[PDB]
C-alpha cells in the first residue's frame, strides 16, 4: 500500500509499505519512519492508497518501497535515522559503563532478527561473565562496515597530543570489520547526517540489510531501555545552591553595566559608531552586554549539570532539545524580541503602565531575568507572550507562501 500525509512536501512523504493487520482503530508504523512524514502522534491522520493491479503493485514494490528511499537525492543524506527514545538509549547503552549479565544478554540477543545464533564471548570472563554494550551492539552492525565519527562532546584537545586513539572520554567512534571498537553514538552517528553509520551501511551493503539494521537497533535497544528506563523530573532541572548565586551575580553585573551605558547616553558621551544612529549604536551596545550575560549564564548552567542529569542525556545525544533550552530552564530565559527589535513602546514612551516613561533599562524593555523553573514575573510573562505571538504568527503565515 502507498501511504500518505498531507501536505506532501517531497517524495519521501509518499512511500509504499507492507500491510500487517492489527486490532483497534489506528494505523501503526515504526518510528524511524516518523521523520520522513514530519508526523508526531497527536490526532494525526494519514491516507492509505491500495494498488488494484499486480503491474502497479510491482511498480510500487520496485520503486516506492521504503527501504529503497532511505537516502534522499535532495541532500544525499539518509532520510530516516534513530529518533526519540532509541537514540538516547543508544547513547546511554553504548557507554563503557554498561555491563550486562547473562540473562539480559539472552533477551537482547533474542530480539536480534539477523543474529547467527552464536553467543559472543564476553568482555570480562572472570570472576563473572559480563558482556558490554558495545560488544552486543557490534552484533547489530551488519556485514563488515567501516566508519569513523566523533561524538558531540568530543573536544579538540584529544587530537593534538597523546591519547589520540585512547580518548579518555571514550569519545570519537571506530567501526572496523563490522565491529564497534570505541566511541559513543549520538545524532552524529546513527542519526541522519552525511556519511553517518547508517548511510555507510546503505551504500556499502545495501538497502535490504540496512532495513534490518534499523529494525534490530529499534527492538533490542528499546527492550533494553526497559531495564534502566528514562525520565525527566524536577531534580533534573535544579542546579547547585552555588550556581544560583553565580548566575544572579552575573545578572546583576550585566544590569549594572547597562545602567552605566544608559547613564553615558544621557550625558551624550556616547559616540555614534560610523554607519549607525545614536539609537542604533545604543541598542547595539546593550544587545552586546545582554547577550554576553545570557550566554555566560547559559554556559555556567551547562557546567553545573551532573552526568546523571537527564537534560544532558537528551541534549548530548541530540535526540531532542538543545543547550539553549537547558539555559532557559536553569539560568535565564533571556531577551524577548518583537519584530527583531527589543520590546517596543505601545504606550506613550513607555512599554507598560508600571514602568516610568523613557526607561531603556533591561527590565522595562523585556529582558527576562527569571527562568522557567523559578517562574516569570508578571511583566516578564506578558513580554514573554508578546515574544511567542511573533513565533505563532510566523508559523501560520509562512506555510501559504512556501506551499505556493
Amino acid at each position: 500500500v502507498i501511504f500518505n500525509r498531507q501536505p506532501t512536501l517531497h517524495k519521501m512523504s509518499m512511500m509504499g509499505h507492507r500491510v500487517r493487520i492489527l486490532p483497534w482503530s489506528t494505523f501503526r508504523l515504526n518510528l524511524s519512519v516518523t521523520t520522513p512524514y514530519n508526523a508526531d502522534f497527536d490526532g494525526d491522520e494519514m491516507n492509505l492508497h491500495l494498488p488494484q493491479s499486480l503491474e502497479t503493485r510491482a511498480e510500487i514494490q520496485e520503486l516506492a518501497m521504503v527501504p529503497r528511499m532511505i537516502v534522499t537525492p535532495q541532500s544525499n543524506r539518509p532520510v530516516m535515522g534513530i529518533v526519540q527514545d532509541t537514540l538516547t538509549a543508544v547513547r546511554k547503552f553504548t557507554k563503557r559503563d554498561v555491563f550486562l549479565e547473562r540473562g539480559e544478554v539472552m533477551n537482547l540477543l533474542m530480539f536480534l532478527s539477523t543474529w547467527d545464533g552464536k553467543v559472543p564471548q564476553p568482555a570480562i570472563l572472570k570472576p563473572r561473565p559480563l558482556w558490554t554494550g558495545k560488544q552486543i551492539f557490534s552484533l547489530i552492525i551488519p556485514g563488515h562496515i567501516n566508519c569513523i565519527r566523533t561524538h558531540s562532546t568530543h573536544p579538540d584537545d584529544e587530537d593534538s597530543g597523546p591519547y589520540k586513539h585512547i580518548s579518555p572520554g571514550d569519545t570519537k567512534v571506530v567501526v572496523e570489520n563490522g565491529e564497534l571498537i570505541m566511541g559513543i553514538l549520538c545524532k552524529k552517528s546513527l542519526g541522519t547526517s552525511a556519511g553517518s553509520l547508517v548511510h555507510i551501511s546503505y551504500l556499502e551493503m545495501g538497502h535490504d540489510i540496512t532495513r534490518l539494521f534499523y529494525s534490530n537497533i529499534q527492538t533490542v535497544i528499546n527492550n533494553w531501555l526497559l531495564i534502566e528506563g528514562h525520565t525527566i523530573g524536577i531534580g533534573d532541572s535544579i542546579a547547585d545552591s552555588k550556581t544560583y548565586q553565580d548566575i544572579q551575580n552575573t545578572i546583576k553585573k550585566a544590569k549594572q553595566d547597562v545602567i552605566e551605558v544608559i547613564e553615558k547616553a544621557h550625558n551624550n558621551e556616547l559616540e555614534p559608531t560610523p554607519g549607525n544612529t545614536l539609537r542604533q549604536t545604543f541598542e547595539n551596545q546593550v544587545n552586546r552586554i545582554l547577550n554576553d550575560a545570557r550566554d555566560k549564564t547559559g554556559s555556567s548552567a551547562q557546567k553545573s549539570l551532573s552526568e546523571y542529569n537527564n537534560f544532558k542525556s537528551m541534549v548530548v545525544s541530540g535526540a531532542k532539545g538543545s543547550k539553549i533550552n537547558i539555559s532557559q530552564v536553569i539560568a535565564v530565559v533571556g531577551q524577548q524580541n518583537v519584530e527583531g527589535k527589543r520590546i517596543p513602546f505601545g504606550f506613550k514612551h513607555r512599554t507598560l503602565p508600571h514602568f516610568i516613561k523613557d526607561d531603556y533599562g533591561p527590565e522595562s524593555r523585556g529582558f527576562v531575568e527569571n527562568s522557567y523553573l523559578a517562574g516569570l514575573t508578571p511583566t516578564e510573562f506578558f513580554f514573554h507572550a508578546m515574544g511567542g505571538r511573533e513565533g505563532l504568527i510566523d508559523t501560520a503565515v509562512k506555510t501559504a507562501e512556501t506551499g505556493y
Binding site: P127, R128, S306, Y308
Partner: protein, 257 residues
C-alpha cells in the same frame, strides 16, 4: 539443575491484609506470583445485567457498569462454580451463575440511597460484602429501579472487576546491595520499612556475588476473598497452568516423533 526450595514468614495477618516473606527463591517466580495475585485468581463479580424500569437520573449501562464493580463474597463457592464457557446447558443454571435481584422505589420525599445491601441473592453464601454500604445510586421521590443480574466466575485478565485484590506491594533488596537501581545521590532517599541499616549510612555496600532473595510482600484484599486464600488460590491456579503445559507439551513431543 533443580528447583530451589523456598520459605515463608507471615508477619501481619488481618482480614484486610497479609504481609509474608518468601525466601530462597528466584526473582521471576516472585514477580509471577505477585502477578497471579492480580491476573489469574478466580472470583465472582456481576456480569450479565438486565434492567426493567430505570427512572433514575443515571442512564442504564452506567448503573449496570457499577453493578459489576461491587465485590461479592467469593470465599467458598468459586471452587464449585464452573466457567460459563465450560457449562453444559444453554443460558444459565445454578452451576454457572448466581442470580441477584434489585427492587427499589422511593415513596418518601427524602432521597433514598440505593446500596449493595438492597441486592438480594438466591443463595446465602454470596452477600454483597455485608455481614459500610456500597452506594449504587440515589433516587428522588417517584424514581424507581428494578433489575435482574447474573454474576459469573471470572478472573482479572478479562475485566478489572474480577481483580480479587487491591494494590499488591512487592519489594526486594530494600537496602540496596545489588545496585539494580543507582541513586545519583543516595543520601536524599528515605529508607524502606524493611531497612536493616543504621541511619548514618545511606546504603549497604555493594555485593557482587549476591542475587535477589527474601522477597517482601503485602497483599491487601478487596473483601471478596479473605487475603489468606488469595495466595493459596493464586499458587493453585499457576500450578494448574504449569501442569497443563506439561500435559499438552508431552502430547506434542509424543505426536511429532
Amino acid at each position: 539443575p533443580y528447583a530451589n526450595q523456598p520459605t515463608v514468614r507471615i508477619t501481619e495477618l488481618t482480614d484486610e491484609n497479609v504481609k509474608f516473606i518468601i525466601e530462597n527463591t528466584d526473582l521471576a517466580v516472585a514477580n509471577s506470583i505477585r502477578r497471579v495475585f492480580i491476573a489469574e485468581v478466580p472470583i465472582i463479580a456481576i456480569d450479565w445485567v438486565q434492567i426493567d424500569a430505570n427512572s433514575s437520573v443515571l442512564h442504564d449501562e452506567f448503573i449496570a457498569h457499577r453493578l459489576g464493580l461491587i465485590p461479592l463474597t467469593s470465599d467458598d463457592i468459586v471452587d464449585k462454580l464452573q466457567y460459563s464457557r465450560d457449562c453444559t446447558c444453554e443460558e444459565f443454571c445454578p452451576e454457572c451463575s448466581v442470580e441477584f435481584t434489585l427492587d427499589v422505589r422511593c415513596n418518601e420525599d427524602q432521597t433514598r440511597h440505593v446500596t449493595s445491601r438492597d441486592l438480594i441473592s438466591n443463595s446465602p453464601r454470596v452477600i454483597p460484602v455485608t455481614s459500610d454500604d456500597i452506594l449504587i445510586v440515589k433516587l428522588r421521590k417517584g424514581q424507581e429501579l428494578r433489575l435482574r443480574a447474573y454474576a459469573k466466575k471470572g478472573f482479572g485478565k478479562e475485566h478489572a472487576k474480577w481483580n480479587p485484590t487491591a494494590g499488591v506491594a512487592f519489594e526486594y533488596d530494600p537496602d540496596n546491595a545489588l545496585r539494580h537501581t543507582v541513586y545519583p545521590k543516595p543520601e536524599e532517599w528515605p529508607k524502606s520499612e524493611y531497612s536493616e541499616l543504621d541511619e548514618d549510612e545511606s546504603q549497604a555496600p555493594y555485593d557482587p556475588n549476591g542475587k535477589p532473595e527474601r522477597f517482601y510482600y503485602n497483599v491487601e484484599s478487596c473483601g471478596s476473598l479473605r487475603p489468606e486464600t488469595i495466595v493459596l488460590s493464586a499458587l493453585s491456579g499457576l500450578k494448574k497452568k504449569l501442569s497443563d503445559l506439561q500435559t499438552q507439551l508431552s502430547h506434542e513431543i509424543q505426536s511429532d516423533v
